[PDB]
């Protein structure tokens with residue numbers, strides 16, 4: 001199979017999925033490799049090739065530091081890159097239904113990873129199931145991360161910031177220019193992503209350069225208004241100068257620092273990325289999105305509040321235990337190999353880890369808001385309270401505030417609460433429905449009967465896959481055939497949302513009302 005793109009011909013592979021066929025094009029280049037003088041620059045356009053490019057294996061992953069907290073443990077290593085790390089990494093993948101569709105809706109995946117890590121070749125991002133079951137086209141791209149993707153001295157085009165975001169944007173442009181040759185519909189394109197990928201998706205709703213490159217958006221466990229998602233412009237320049245100091249690149253003429261950084265090999269950049277922040281947290285984002293005056297014209301909180309974004313439908317949601325994953329990355333008394341019963345004193349030490357520069361009074365009122373027990377005798381009270389603190393503050397409350405503000409401008413919005421713990425989840429039970437472990441259900445991995453998911457998990461995945469595809473195709477995430485409960489629109493007044501679980505599906509209102517009132521209204525003033 002060979003498809004003529006506008007820059008040259010590409011060859012894919014046939015895959016057998018569920019007694020049928022899916023065609024895969026893995027590793028299509030969409031930009032000139034950002035090497036040499038092109039490091040830290042925005043992505044440049046690709047030049048034509050007259051031969052046939054073989055797109056038959058995942059391409060290199062972008063340079064990044066690997067998680068090594070649990071060597072040999074599948075729970076953490078399933079997120080580590082599974083191809084070689086290289087600066088030559090700006091490639092994308094395309095999954096096509098077989099036979100060739102005539103005008104299929106396109107789903108574009110943007111992976112997360114704190115803007116520091118990530119790759120589209122991960123097993124749980126495999127788009128072949130979605131192409132097979134719902135006959136949509138799935139696209140995913142690799143984008144630069146860390147300093148090589150988000151180092152910023154604003155206004156300076158040698159390192160303007162938001163390069164990884166522009167990588168994503170150029171991939172969206174590739175779909176616009178090429179997807180029809182694959183049988184796809186460039187007028188029906190839905191972005192979806194998780195964590196930092198969901199925050200990227202929400203920034204594409206704000207960026208005018210991206211407004212004509214997609215139709216709808218899905219935000220799983222993330223948004224730009226989350227406290228970890230946007231780097232202040234003070235912080236950006238500090239961490240840039242700190243990295244120059246650590247490497248030996250402190251110049252005075254600010255353009256001369258970047259040329260010094262361009263002569264360091266990528267490994268010396270990666271080794272020093274960690275220490276650009278003096279006192280970080282488990283949720284620290286060393287180099288992330290900034291207000292650059294290009295991709296981002298103003299502070300995103302101002303654009304959201306004043307209705308300056310793409311007007312379209314959105315699907316937003318969170319998991320029940322978003323915070324627990326971060327507790328085994330620094331909190332005292334927590335571990336993946338015990339049950340992590342902590343004391344009140346260990347709870348107070350956890351808050352200092354996650355809220356280092358906050359007043360003594362601020363941590364006291366976090367403790368006060370989250371220690372009104374039902375059962376005063378339960379030993380896991382403080383353990384579960386600290387996870388809820390981290391999850392509410394960093395993910396759930398920002399996502400709800402995002403949806404409320406977005407829908408106030410007349411757009412249909414739908415919110416979900418994912419509360420099923422995967423039967424193949426390798427982390428212990430006390431960590432619950434963790435950050436990132438709805439992804440395998442969205443991509444339809446439990447549909448593979450040869451994988452030891454339960455029968456109920458196959459059913460829930462089949463339902464989620466249909467809702468997601470119906471949202472992309474028709475702007476309405478209903479499962480209309482098997483007498484499901486209807487997913488109601490999220491409005492600022494009643495704030496209805498749908499729960500996703502094996503046992504039951506229910507409509508509820510005002511998720512975490514009391515806790516998010518504290519985080520969104522009171523806490524910013526301490």
Ligand SMILES: *[C@@H]1O[C@H](CO[C@H]2O[C@@H](C)[C@@H](O)[C@@H](O)[C@@H]2O)[C@@H](O[C@@H]2O[C@H](CO)[C@@H](O)[C@H](O)[C@H]2NC(C)=O)[C@H](O)[C@H]1NC(C)=O
Nearest residue numbers: 234235237238239241242243245246274275276277278279
């Ligand atoms: C902006 O950065 C400076 C310099 O950052 C240094 O901090 C070290 C801890 C280390 O990471 C090194 O690589 C880096 O260059 C910050 O100054 C430092 O701030 C910390 C925390 O307050 C102090 O402990 C250090 O003594 C201090 N060093 C100096 C030379 O001033 C500065 O605070 C930072 N601005 C922020 C975080 O707003």
Ligand SMILES: *[C@@H]1O[C@H](CO[C@H]2O[C@@H](C)[C@@H](O)[C@@H](O)[C@@H]2O)[C@@H](O[C@@H]2O[C@H](CO)[C@@H](O)[C@H](O)[C@H]2NC(C)=O)[C@H](O)[C@H]1NC(C)=O
Nearest residue numbers: 328329330331332333334335336337338339340341342346
């Ligand atoms: C849950 O585990 C933590 C972590 O303890 C680590 O070190 C060994 C004890 C190992 O067996 C394994 O449990 C784990 O890798 C326990 O906290 C530790 O407690 C000791 C006791 O003095 C302290 O010295 C350590 O600093 C501390 N580690 C951390 C990360 O806080 C904790 O006691 C345990 N809880 C249980 C068993 O209920």
Ligand SMILES: *[C@@H]1O[C@H](CO[C@@H]2O[C@@H](C)[C@@H](O)[C@@H](O)[C@@H]2O)[C@@H](O)[C@H](O)[C@H]1NC(C)=O
Nearest residue numbers: 102103105180185187188189215472473474
């Ligand atoms: C493919 O379909 C195009 C129309 O797509 C529709 O446009 C708007 C209303 C969006 O809501 C989108 O989701 C819809 O699917 C046609 O204009 C085009 O000619 C068609 N092309 C081919 C080759 O069939």
Ligand SMILES: CCN(CC)[C@H](C)CN1c2ccccc2Sc2ccccc21
Nearest residue numbers: 076079113114116117195228282283284
């Ligand atoms: C998949 C990796 N995940 C744990 C194994 C980490 C903690 C996620 N993470 C993350 C991942 C890589 C590097 C830094 C971070 S800080 C962060 C902030 C906001 C969302 C996610 C992240």
Ligand SMILES: *[C@@H]1O[C@H](CO)[C@@H](O)[C@H](O)[C@H]1NC(C)=O
Nearest residue numbers: 011012051052053054055056
């Ligand atoms: C691309 O794939 C075809 C089919 O396997 C192969 O014969 C061809 O030689 C490949 N091109 C290369 C390796 O340049």
Ligand SMILES: *[C@@H]1O[C@H](CO)[C@@H](O)[C@H](O)[C@H]1NC(C)=O
Nearest residue numbers: 251252253254255256257259
């Ligand atoms: C800094 O160096 C650049 C590159 O040579 C030059 O264009 C610019 O004028 C210099 N500016 C200052 C203030 O030295």
Ligand SMILES: *[C@@H]1O[C@H](CO)[C@@H](O)[C@H](O)[C@H]1NC(C)=O
Nearest residue numbers: 459462463466479480481482
């Ligand atoms: C609806 O139910 C049938 C069995 O009655 C099942 O095979 C099918 O996959 C279900 N559809 C969805 C979208 O879940």
Ligand SMILES: [Cl-]
Nearest residue numbers: 187212214215
């Ligand atoms: Cl469009």
Ligand SMILES: [Cl-]
Nearest residue numbers: 283284285286
């Ligand atoms: Cl940070």
Ligand SMILES: [Cl-]
Nearest residue numbers: 319320321419
């Ligand atoms: Cl709950």
Ligand SMILES: [Cl-]
Nearest residue numbers: 344345348367
């Ligand atoms: Cl006390």
Ligand SMILES: [Cl-]
Nearest residue numbers: 313410411412
């Ligand atoms: Cl609408």
Ligand SMILES: [Cl-]
Nearest residue numbers: 507508509510
């Ligand atoms: Cl309710």
Ligand SMILES: [Cl-]
Nearest residue numbers: 510511512513
């Ligand atoms: Cl609640």
Ligand SMILES: [Zn+2]
Nearest residue numbers: 112113195436
């Ligand atoms: Zn992740």
